[PDB]
From a paper:
First, in the structure of MTHFD1/LY374571, the nicotinamide group of NADP+ was hydrogen bonded with the NH2 moiety of the triaminopyrimidine headgroup of LY374571. Moreover, the electron density of the γ-carboxylic acid in 16e is weaker than that observed in LY374571. The shift of γ-carboxylic acid in 16e resulted in the loss of the van der Waals interactions with Leu51, Tyr52 and Tyr240. These effects collectively contributed to the weaker inhibitory activity of 16e toward MTHFD1 and consequently improved its selectivity to MTHFD2, as shown by the increase in the selectivity index from 7.9 to 27.1 compared with LY374571.
Methylenetetrahydrofolate dehydrogenase/cyclohydrolase 2 (MTHFD2) is a bifunctional metabolic enzyme found in mitochondria, exhibiting both dehydrogenase and cyclohydrolase catalytic activities.
Numbering used by the authors:
A (entry chain A), B (entry chain B): 3 to 242, 251 to 296
C (entry chain C): 2 to 246, 249 to 296
D (entry chain D): 4 to 240, 251 to 296
The structure:
């Protein structure tokens, strides 16, 4: 059976390294501290949970994180005002808008996201940062935090990515599409699948590397997995318990390496956000 | 044998149609013309040819196209003076920098391209337009002209794209990477290959749709082709004669539809540029 | 448990020291004489710039005059052919090579260019003449490609006789894999050659008492495949993206597992790489000595 | 075990070549393919083989001249004849029958490598060998015995790519070019020779097996892999091959008899290359 990729343990190493890094910055530049802001619209329970998890990690590391929660009935004009203020506040080094917005009024998510200054866009969701990533200009952009965490998990196997066939199932702005770009510029041959893909099972079977981000619980069957594959399950699905987008039991029999759910991608996503935040803070000093 | 996709004929139809739009807009808004500018650094032979073809097309349609040719000794800051000037000239509706820059100095191509105002970026090469396309926001952006042209050639076959498996060989900023995005958001399942892909022949054979943009003369062999494939060949190679990146003679015995070289993608690239220029002229009027 | 390391960095240094002393003696025995190598480059590929510079530095340390001729990517075939003719006829140039691949805007027939090199100056062993002599076992009338030369020296460093053993070569390229097969064969190994159309590569690899890998596919050859006790020679130099560095160099062999199965193994970097350069200097010195005779 | 009948197969190649030579003569009147065979000494085996080749050329319509130099020929005298055959625009291909039988010490390598590669229809020059051994198969002459062996293997209809082939013998004229030829048809190839340990086990790996050792019936049928394609190049004097034919026939799926197997194919491939050098000259 597969080696388990323990996201809980790996993310802990990353947070301790960031913690010590932040401590050293404070020693070298007294009074300085990385500052994150999280903006939310509405009151979705899962958004509440994930934001709380992010605040706890910021606090462990010594990043000052402020959470601003606007009600369901806010207007796009109201959110734009807050984004402008965060852009202009020079003590805020990065900030993000937790998605999806949960609003009674139609609010243009792409307009809201794209008002974020690219230098503070630690979620890497602006068009500017996406376009840098999608075209291989990887050193001047924030990369979205879940693809970053997935990449670090793949690298924990010690198997080089270059030349491997990687399959990404899902193409969302937040996970699937940036994952494809990250694997491409790590020199994998990449196939991207979606809801219009036919013969998904045969596409999945091509992947030496498989990243699944669909939101469909255990829809990717273990019998489809290429023997020896590295399997990265981004799913967090609540069912009659938490399960991933991959059928874990059968997949684990065939994979060389696999992420458990929970304790896999989830903690790595949060740790990567903290890493990007520390990076913007260091960039701000210089 | 495959039906020939005749880009030379298809483009003529597009250009004749564009001329009618331009004539119609000239009488509906008197004294108004679409205005294009093409900036060149250095004196490459192929760049000279391609710029000349674009000027020819713009002349036939009624677009006022200017060609600024800077010497090989141009600095990055001299280039930025022209880009800044073109952004600010309200009479210029779109402009592009022919690539690659041929300068004996070192010029950050990315810094130059990304100084172009996005609403004049008729080549779709800025990060902003690339990020929109790469995230599926296809109604807000300029799409690179060679991908635009390849999509039109594919539609001319009448075979729907949704659910087919598309293989793109090459990932360049100008062609291969935007070709992947355009096919993906037309709901193909897409594999991208490059110089590090292993078993390229096996990977090419999965493509119901095959777009080759490698700059390697006749490198993709006909034996590799999936029987019945739609074969789109972007290569323009001068060999001991002009050949594409696909071995055309034997690929024709396998494809259901194939683009010749010359007379395939090339003229479509130019027509699609004139289309985007007219689109930004109409956009400017509102 | 772990395999002994074939330290190409140390071994190549012993070779260059030896060549240094014997070029210092040649410059005394025949005053005013300097062994001279030319490197012809078309284009400006970044990896080619590094390997050329690494070769020039080795030449300079030993006392070889090495001339880098870099033609722009606009160069035509007939223009390259004029340079090669010029180096063929320049009697102060004892060896020269064309760094491959050529990086030109124009298509240049690489075989035409390479085979125009005079075989007695073909210190890279790339002409069809030198390849034909090697491939038919006529080893003392030819220049052997530098990477296979370095690999053979690394193999002999083990102290393990080659005759009788089963050798597996993964890769059949003109520069490395095919001349490697010939060199092992005429050293009396039984030799199996693998490539991209080999089925059960893992089983074929498992046959190799001697294993030479030259595929350019990073760590594709799994350690689990390695025959226990094998001598493992890794020719791979693969630059894999690495945002913690911005890349790193890895071999064609998964070293961390392979070294628990092999008796001897080359690390990457520091293995075949420096030996390749040391062998070029050795062949260059040999061609200068042959010029005097 | 099916029988690869070189005598029948070669007859078809010679008939195909014959008509091909007839059509060529009708298209360019007064033009015929011309071969020259040079011999040093008077070995009986070479007299026989050269005669068999001359006869094949006559059946097809190739004009072949045989020049036989004495045992006391010098290297210099042989070189004069090669220079003349190179410079004779009438001659499209020529070969030197090997081994040279000379009282004097003559460098065979030197003699062979003075042949112009465009006329080297035996493929024995270092130039043609280096093209073949590096996979540039499109512009060289492949030695005739390996050419014929490959034709025999293809006659089975079993594809070569991905099969494991074993070659026993590494000689300049058969074994070494035979390895190259199978390799660039994408077999995985093992070469064995007189220093190969456990030759029995090695031979057992071959889906394709070519034996070119000159050791009468040394390869035992018990060694053959069941279903193997067995190609026997041996001509050992009764005449028998290098494979124990009776036992090997109970294991192989296809097998060459000796005589009537490779032997006829070798001669037909030389004629094929001669006709081919005549076409290249016509342009
Ligand atoms: N920290 C973390 O672990 C983390 C972070 C973010 C998200 N996630 C999780 O990842 C999962 C997906 O998230 P998302 O943001 O990517 O959501 P999303 O916007 O709903 O995207 C779903 C994607 O999956 C595709 N898909 C749906 N059904 C499919 C099917 N039957 N076959 C193939 N593709 C199919 C959709 O295809 P179309 O494009 O054709 O609709 C779409 O591209 C969820 O469980 C989410 O919580 C986890
Ligand atoms: N109107 C038109 O028809 C039109 C318009 C624009 C361009 N083009 C043509 O499209 C072609 C593009 O090539 P270029 O060199 O000019 O651009 P380039 O920017 O050098 O891109 C070459 C792409 O092909 C890949 N590639 C190179 N060798 C390969 C191989 N052996 N196997 C697989 N992939 C390989 C490269 O991979 P890496 O990324 O790994 O290096 C890269 O992604 C040219 O012929 C160009 O003229 C045509
Ligand atoms: N000093 C040194 O260390 C040194 C010097 C020179 C070169 N090199 C290195 O040697 C490596 C290869 O270079 P090269 O010129 O030999 O490369 P190449 O021309 O790209 O050839 C690679 C060979 O490997 C084979 N191959 C590819 N994938 C395979 C697979 N999955 N299974 C089996 N065989 C496979 C190919 O098979 P096909 O033949 O069927 O295509 C081909 O023969 C590179 O890392 C290069 O930098 C190192
Ligand atoms: N027209 C035809 O059909 C035709 C044409 C030419 C030749 N032939 C025949 O083919 C046979 C071989 O000819 P050749 O020119 O190749 O002869 P050769 O030059 O004597 O070569 C014999 C090869 O077999 C190897 N060998 C000898 N004993 C061996 C053993 N016990 N185990 C393994 N390998 C062994 C030798 O190995 P070493 O290299 O280690 O000595 C050598 O490589 C002869 O019978 C010859 O007449 C037939
Ligand atoms: N702007 C914006 N909008 C978004 N929707 C996202 N997505 C997002 O935050 N996802 C997300 C983040 C963290 C977890 C998580 O915490 N998982 C752990 C359990 C707790 C632990 O970490 O200890 C586990 O599974 O083990 C799970 C998820 Cl789905 C974003 O990133 N940016
Ligand atoms: N900024 C920027 N930089 C770039 N380098 C490009 N690329 C580009 O212009 N390519 C390009 C454009 C046209 C042709 C062509 O005209 N081909 C015709 C022959 C003439 C005809 O009849 O039209 C044919 O093949 O038949 C061929 C090519 Cl390669 C770009 O688009 N933007
Ligand atoms: N004509 C022609 N064309 C070619 N492309 C080649 N190949 C070639 O030069 N390869 C090559 C050479 C040297 C290195 C290297 O620097 N290796 C060392 C580090 C420093 C050291 O050399 O000491 C290490 O890995 O530790 C790496 C490589 Cl890939 C050729 O030989 N002839
Ligand atoms: N330059 C050079 N030198 C060389 N020594 C060779 N070798 C060579 O000719 N060998 C050779 C050739 C033909 C036969 C033969 O006659 N075989 C048939 C019988 C009748 C028929 O040929 O049809 C059979 O056995 O059935 C047998 C052999 Cl050993 C060469 O090729 N080139």
């Amino acid at each position: 059976p597969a080696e388990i990729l323990n996201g809980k343990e790996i993310s802990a190493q990353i947070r301790a390294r960031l913690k010590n890094q932040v401590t050293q910055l404070k020693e070298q530049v007294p009074g300085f501290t990385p500052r994150l802001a999280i903006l939310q619209v509405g009151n979705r329970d899962d958004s509440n949970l994930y934001i709380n998890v992010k605040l706890k990690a910021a606090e462990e590391i010594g990043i000052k994180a402020t959470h601003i929660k606007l009600p369901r009935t806010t207007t796009e004009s109201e959110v734009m005002k807050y984004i402008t203020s965060l852009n202009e506040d020079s003590t805020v080094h990065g900030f993000l808008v937790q998605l999806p917005l949960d609003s009674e009024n139609s609010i243009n998510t792409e307009e809201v996201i794209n008002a974020i200054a690219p230098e503070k866009d630690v979620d890497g969701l602006t068009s500017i940062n996406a376009g840098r990533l999608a075209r291989g200009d990887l050193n001047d952009c924030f990369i979205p935090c879940t693809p970053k965490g997935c990449l670090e998990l793949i690298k924990e196997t010690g198997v080089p990515i270059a030349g491997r066939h990687a399959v990404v199932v899902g193409r969302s702005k937040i996970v699937g599409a940036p994952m494809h770009d990250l694997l491409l510029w790590n020199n994998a041959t990449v196939t991207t699948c979606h809801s219009k893909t036919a013969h998904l099972d045969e596409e999945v079977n091509k992947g030496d590397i498989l990243v699944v981000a669909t939101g469909q619980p255990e829809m990717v069957k273990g019998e489809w997995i290429k023997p020896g594959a590295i399997v990265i399950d981004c799913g967090i699905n609540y069912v009659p318990k938490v399960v991933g987008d991959v059928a874990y039991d059968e997949a684990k029999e065939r994979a060389s390496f696999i992420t458990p759910v929970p304790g896999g991608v989830g903690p790595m996503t949060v740790a990567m956000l903290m890493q990007s935040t520390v990076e913007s803070a260091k960039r701000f000093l210089e």
